[PDB]
Design a protein around this ligand. Structure first.
Ligand SMILES: [Mg+2]
Ligand SMILES: [Mg+2]
Ligand SMILES: [Mg+2]
Ligand SMILES: [Mg+2]
Ligand SMILES: [Mg+2]
Ligand SMILES: [Mg+2]
Ligand SMILES: [Mg+2]
Ligand SMILES: [Mg+2]
Ligand SMILES: [Mg+2]
Ligand SMILES: [Mg+2]
Ligand SMILES: [Mg+2]
Ligand SMILES: [Mg+2]
Ligand SMILES: [Mg+2]
Ligand SMILES: [Mg+2]
Ligand SMILES: [Mg+2]
Ligand SMILES: [Mg+2]
Ligand SMILES: [Mg+2]
Ligand SMILES: [Mg+2]
Ligand SMILES: [Mg+2]
Lengths: 144, 149, 146, 257, 129, 172
RNA sequence: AAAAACCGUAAAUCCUAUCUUUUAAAGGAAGGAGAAGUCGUAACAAGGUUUCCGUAGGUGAACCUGCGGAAGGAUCAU
RNA sequence: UUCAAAGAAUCAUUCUUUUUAAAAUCCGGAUUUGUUACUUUGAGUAAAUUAGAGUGUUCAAAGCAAACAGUUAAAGCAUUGUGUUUGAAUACUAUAGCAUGGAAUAACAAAAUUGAACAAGCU
RNA sequence: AAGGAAUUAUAACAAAGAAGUAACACGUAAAGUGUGUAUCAAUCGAGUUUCUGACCUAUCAGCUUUUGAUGUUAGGGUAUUGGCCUAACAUGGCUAUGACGGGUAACGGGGAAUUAGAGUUCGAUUCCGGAGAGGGAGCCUGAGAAAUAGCUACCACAUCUAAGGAAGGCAGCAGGCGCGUAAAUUACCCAAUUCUAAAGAAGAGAGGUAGUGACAAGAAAUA
């Protein structure tokens, strides 16, 4: 025996079991449940624009020892408060305490990244100038 | 086995030669008559066959007479309305029910009663599908007892 | 009793007074039964006796019901292939058909029905030929590939 | 609001027009007329894409304005008038006579033709009505009504029909061995003899048509156009003579040149 | 219980081959099974076999040439169109150069190559290497 | 209005996704009555006019036995297998049994042969004869006056006539 | 022609009812993270009462105890 | 539940021809015989896309065009005049529906407290 | 005389009976044309309609039926069939092969991406079909509209007004605000492709041509 039915006229069972079971696949569930749109700040989007509310430090996971510089921002789209880690060696000060930040994902869909506890977002533009550009500095300077 | 975990293979297995053996003297008519007599005397098909095998010298009514014994009974018109095996099952069920009525706490009996009921329903269904039973025939736990006769 | 309605059930296409009862052939080799040619009964939507011409599809079914007046239900049972599993699966569909009392049809009887115009909200078919057949469970449950 | 559609999109145009995808957004949309748009061809296409007398629609229109192009001998100034399967075109200035035929592909060619043969046209009857005064009228694929047609004419057969005058010459029954052309699917150009007709009860009457390479092909009776008796066709067929070669054979032929 | 006699028979045969038997008692003979065996014989994989007639479902005993690598049924006897064959054979049998994929076809049972030659595909019984 | 907006046979609500397309036209019933003639024209589809008779009287009535017809005032409606309301309101429809001023037929008969082309040999019913004696005879309508705009009908005969009489039956 | 009456389409507004969907809330009670914080030592060794199950009661907390199970026991063994 | 058998070609195998029962049909000869699944052929489908044929868009993505002969004519074919060959294939267009060859595999239908086939007789 | 099948074509008889058959305009062709007109057929179609075919959900299992749910009869209505609507009479119909609900960040399909082969996802978006013109509803005209650069009304927005009234509907093209992670010029033209017309000769933000354009795609310097 196989486990599955392998009848010629078996197709109904075969389809139906697969349909029920698909939902055990985590990835599939993430894709096809409706709670995606509800319970997500970006609301199914690449980036989002948020004004900043608080420049804040976040202490890293136990083995590593740093205070990672985050920015607690409010999405204009959604009215959602989220921490977004700011890259760069000294790029917290490149932003203002109230600046229209454009924030992206961190690289792992929702799932959090690296040393950081539960900051799923990467600010990547401030006052329309590119954070990366500012970091490089040879390219650009923050307009205000 | 349909219901237990029994897996035994005890069986009659008939001989290769199916044209009757030389030593069999009985002409077919006589054997038919004998069969009829047996039927009249209250015996059921299987029992009749057994009797034929033992008391008279004859292995298989199929080799002496082209027909099997149930068929010949039918031809003669002394066939039961209610088939052998099914009837037996019904009887058993009835017996079980009486016991249950008497003796309410018997769980094993009840379980076995259910099994026999199920088997009846299978057998019953099969007979309906042919034409030995009428389609208007459910088996009822209330009636059952009267049915067997 | 033939005249059961508030109106007189006549038979259009009869021609009572002059000339040398009315039925037609319906075609596709479906023999008009004795009960249509003989045997008075008026039906506007009999294929043979009435004024509906059968044309379009012909599909065999198996009757599930006689409960409606001069009207029958037939489940077609068939096999929907699903290419993913390269397997089939029993599927079905209940076509309501008009009967006409030429055919005495108990349930489980095989019928063949021609199309015809829309006779009612759902009955687009009428039964042309009724094979007998016998059934033991419920017609509901009999699969007969067809 | 929603009624009929006046435009035709150039990709939705029927392939045997052989239009471009580029070179326009739209197509000409045959006027209503004596032919079914999917098996017709407007005059514009003939003038512009087939004969190439015109470069543009404008030029075609201009040409039409001079009352010089006749289709079945009476003039037409409607650029998008549908010409269709068998019809003789008489471009008056060149003194050219064309007859539309099919290629061995689906495509219309204008065939080129003599004065003498031009004066008739084949026409397949479709329906044969009875009308008032028990007079029978045939109805041809040319969307033309022939009245007082000879009684022996039956529903599928062709009729050699004169153009100078509306009356008929002769008719060719739909027989078991009658020279036939096709006018629809796959085997469209094909010309054969007929082996057999099926005559299905409720359905389309399928027929089988042996070629002159003895390659049998089937076809609906619908879209078959009787063209002769077993011996000779009653029209001049194109160069190929309705002998749809195999692909390989065609390629070989192409190579040998 | 039994369902597909043929499958069981083939399994038995395979087992015998694996052990390196010589003889092997295929226990319910079937017309289809017989046909299959004949086909196998034709393409060399099997020797003689003495379909013994009881007065029931017969027994075959079959003579093996130590030559089969595997033989098998492919249950669900999938209908298989002539165009659909090639992919199936690619999926199944070890090389295009050898092995045989046996179809029941309205022109009796025959291998994939045979089917191709004919024109008709049909339902797919089994195979060997 | 000729359209969907209706349950699905399984008894599921067809969620409507389409207005009302004019070709699903359900223009309202002409309850055509007795009276002096009066008919309007309603403009159906391709300028296909149809004649909403709204009052009527002088329909063409046939006599099937002899296969002839005559135009008569119709003096009353007496049965309607649809509903009794219609008959109360004296409304003519395509299977109303009504009473014809039936002198014309009698006159015709007199002209032709006797007193109460020619395949005569049938020579009348008893019931029908009796009816004629009072002047006024029962007759179906057969046109659909609301469409056609004429109260054309025919005289009710033998078996059907008897049935209608029975239906009418008075009694209590 | 206006105006009117009656059916019939029937917008819209209001009133409920129900449902769906976001959303507030004193308090409650979980969870996860963090910080070398308090109290024990439960588990891992016969883990110092073998462990674990189901169930019932208990107890600051791990847990304890009863009943019947299991070896995933520390016994394949008289 | 009709298994099989025999002959000819080819490099043990491949493809072909012929017959071995019973019933109805046709002038001793010759020719129809369950249903559906399945399969094979078709038929009928818009093109665009896709696969794919042809075609040096300078290549290529393309497109559906083109090629050929000439400092200006020969050659052809037409009865001084007229360029010529052509191409824009084919396949894909379900899982259903349509017709279709079918021997295998599947179903189902036919089939005995009795079922129908003939020859005679009577209505 | 067909069609597999006729209450079909058709023919006769008895009754009604629309509309029509040029009170029109050119000067043409080798006597012709334009415009109009009854019926028929063709055609451009349209409406209905048969069968088969769809995603997620059973933490949706019973639904539908006074309010037509299922059928029969008679009608009314329709261009025609039909609970499409009315009346009268049945008590049906669908459902574990998932009815009925719910969800869809769903218009459908041709297709797109990605795949050895299966498949999985996508398909607002060049074509076909459906639907809608702020929201519903209602009409007139007409062959065709339940039309929206037609009209009536209400709701929701909103413009001018001398305050009496009046008009208005970009999901046409540009263009603007808003929303937003997120998207171009208030350009030139009817030359091509087509449509409409009293039909070469006029119109067409249909359509095309440029402008913006690192959406993609191809070729290709920096020796
Ligand atoms: Mg069991
Ligand atoms: Mg056993
Ligand atoms: Mg609209
Ligand atoms: Mg201890
Ligand atoms: Mg411890
Ligand atoms: Mg311990
Ligand atoms: Mg205690
Ligand atoms: Mg304690
Ligand atoms: Mg009612
Ligand atoms: Mg949507
Ligand atoms: Mg789309
Ligand atoms: Mg959307
Ligand atoms: Mg808007
Ligand atoms: Mg509107
Ligand atoms: Mg607008
Ligand atoms: Mg509005
Ligand atoms: Mg715009
Ligand atoms: Mg962009
Ligand atoms: Mg132009």
């Amino acid at each position: 025996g196989s486990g599955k039915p392998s009848g010629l006229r078996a197709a109904r069972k075969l389809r139906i079991r697969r349909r029920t079971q698909r939902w055990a696949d985590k990835s599939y569930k993430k894709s096809h449940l409706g709670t995606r749109w509800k319970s997500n700040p970006f609301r199914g989007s690449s980036h989002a624009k948020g004004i900043v509310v608080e420049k804040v430090a976040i202490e890293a996971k136990q083995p590593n020892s740093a205070y990672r510089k985050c920015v607690r921002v409010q999405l204009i789209k959604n009215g959602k408060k989220i921490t977004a880690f700011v890259p760069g060696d000294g790029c917290l000060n490149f932003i203002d305490e109230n600046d229209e930040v454009l924030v992206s994902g961190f690289g792992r869909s929702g799932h959090s990244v690296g040393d950081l506890p539960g900051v799923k977002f990467k600010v990547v533009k401030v006052a329309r100038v590119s954070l990366l550009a500012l970091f490089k500095e040879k390219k650009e300077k923050p307009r205000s | 086995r349909m219901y237990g975990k029994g897996k035994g293979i005890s069986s009659s297995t008939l001989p290769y030669k199916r044209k009757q053996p030389s030593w069999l003297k009985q002409k077919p008519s006589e054997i038919e008559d004998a069969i009829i007599k047996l039927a009249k005397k209250g015996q059921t098909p299987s029992q009749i066959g057994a009797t034929l095998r033992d008391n008279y010298g004859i292995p298989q009514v199929k080799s002496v007479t082209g027909n099997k014994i149930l068929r010949i009974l039918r031809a003669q018109g002394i066939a039961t309305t209610i088939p052998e095996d099914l009837y037996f099952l019904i009887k058993k069920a009835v017996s079980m029910r009486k016991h249950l009525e008497k003796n309410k706490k018997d769980k094993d009996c009840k379980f076995r009663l259910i099994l026999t009921e199920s088997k009846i329903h299978r057998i019953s269904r099969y007979y309906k599908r042919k034409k030995l039973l009428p389609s208007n025939w459910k088996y009822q736990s209330s009636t059952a007892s009267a049915l067997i006769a | 009793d033939v005249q059961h309605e508030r109106a007189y059930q006549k038979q259009e296409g009869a021609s009572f007074f002059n000339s040398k009862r009315y039925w037609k052939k319906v075609g596709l080799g479906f023999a008009t039964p004795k009960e249509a040619k003989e045997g008075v009964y008026v039906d506007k939507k009999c294929p043979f006796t009435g004024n509906v011409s059968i044309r379009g599809r012909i599909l065999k079914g198996m009757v599930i019901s006689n409960k409606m007046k001069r009207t029958i239900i037939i489940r077609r049972n068939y096999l929907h292939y699903v290419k993913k599993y390269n397997r089939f699966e029993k599927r079905h569909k209940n076509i309501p058909c008009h009967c006409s009392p030429c055919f005495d049809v108990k349930e489980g009887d095989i019928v063949t029905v021609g199309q015809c115009r829309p006779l009612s909200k759902t009955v687009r078919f009428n039964v042309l030929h009724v094979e007998k057949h016998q059934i033991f469970g419920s017609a509901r449950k009999q699969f007969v590939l067809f | 609001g929603k009624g009929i559609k006046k435009h035709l999109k150039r990709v939705n145009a029927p392939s045997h027009w052989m239009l471009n995808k580029m070179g326009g957004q739209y197509a000409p949309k045959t006027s209503s007329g004596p032919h079914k748009l999917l098996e017709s061809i407007p005059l514009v296409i003939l003038l512009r894409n087939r004969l190439k007398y015109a470069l543009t629609f404008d030029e075609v229109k201009m040409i039409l304005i001079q009352k010089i192009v006749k289709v079945d001998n009476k003039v037409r100034t409607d650029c998008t008038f549908p010409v269709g399967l068998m019809d003789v075109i008489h471009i008056t200035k060149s003194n050219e006579y064309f007859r539309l035929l099919y290629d061995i592909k689906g495509r219309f060619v204008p065939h080129r033709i003599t004065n003498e043969e031009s004066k008739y046209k084949l026409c397949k009857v479709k329906k044969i009505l009875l009308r008032k005064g028990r007079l029978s009228i045939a109805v041809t694929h040319d969307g033309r009504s022939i009245p007082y047609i000879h009684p022996d004419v039956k529903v599928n057969d062709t009729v050699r029909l004169d153009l100078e005058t509306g009356k008929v010459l002769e008719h060719l029954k739909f027989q078991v061995g009658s020279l036939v052309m096709v006018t629809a699917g796959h085997s469209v150009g094909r010309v054969g003899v007929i082996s057999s007709i099926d005559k299905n009860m409720g359905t389309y009457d399928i027929i089988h048509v042996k070629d002159s390479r003895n390659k049998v092909f089937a076809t609906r009776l619908s879209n078959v156009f009787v063209i002769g008796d077993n011996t000779k066709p009653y029209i001049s067929l194109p160069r190929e003579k309705g002998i749809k070669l195999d692909i390989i054979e065609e390629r070989r032929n192409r190579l040998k040149a | 219980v039994r369902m597909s006699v043929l499958a069981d028979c083939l399994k038995t045969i395979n087992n015998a081959e694996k052990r390196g038997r010589r003889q092997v008692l295929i226990r319910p003979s079937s017309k289809v099974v017989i046909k299959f065996l004949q086909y196998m014989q034709k393409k060399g994989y099997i020797g003689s076999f003495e379909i013994v007639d009881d007065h029931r479902s017969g027994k075959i005993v079959v003579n093996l040439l130590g030559r089969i690598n595997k033989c098998a049924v492919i249950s669900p006897r999938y209908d298989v169109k002539l165009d659909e064959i090639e992919k199936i054979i690619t999926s199944i049998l070890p090389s295009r150069l050898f092995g045989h994929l046996i179809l029941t076809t309205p022109y009796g049972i025959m291998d994939h190559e045979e089917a191709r030659r004919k024109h008709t595909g049909g339902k797919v019984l089994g195979f060997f290497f | 209005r000729d359209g969907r907006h209706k349950l699905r046979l399984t008894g599921g609500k067809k969620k409507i996704h389409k207005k009302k397309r004019k070709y699903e036209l359900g223009r309202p019933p002409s309850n055509t009555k007795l009276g002096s003639r009066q008919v309007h024209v309603v403009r159906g589809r391709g300028r296909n006019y149809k004649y909403r008779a709204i009052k009527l009287d002088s329909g063409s009535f046939s006599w099937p036995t002899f296969g002839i017809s005559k135009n008569t005032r119709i003096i009353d409606v007496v049965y309607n297998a649809s509903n009794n309301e219609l008959v109360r309101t004296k409304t003519l429809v395509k299977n109303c049994i009504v009473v014809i001023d039936s002198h014309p037929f009698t006159t015709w008969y007199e002209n032709t042969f006797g007193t109460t082309k020619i395949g005569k040999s049938k020579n009348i019913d008893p019931l029908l004869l009796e009816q004629f004696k009072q002047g006024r005879v029962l007759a179906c309508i057969s046109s659909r006056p609301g469409q056609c705009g004429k109260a054309d009908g025919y005289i009710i005969e033998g078996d059907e006539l008897l049935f209608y009489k029975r239906k009418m039956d008075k009694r209590n």
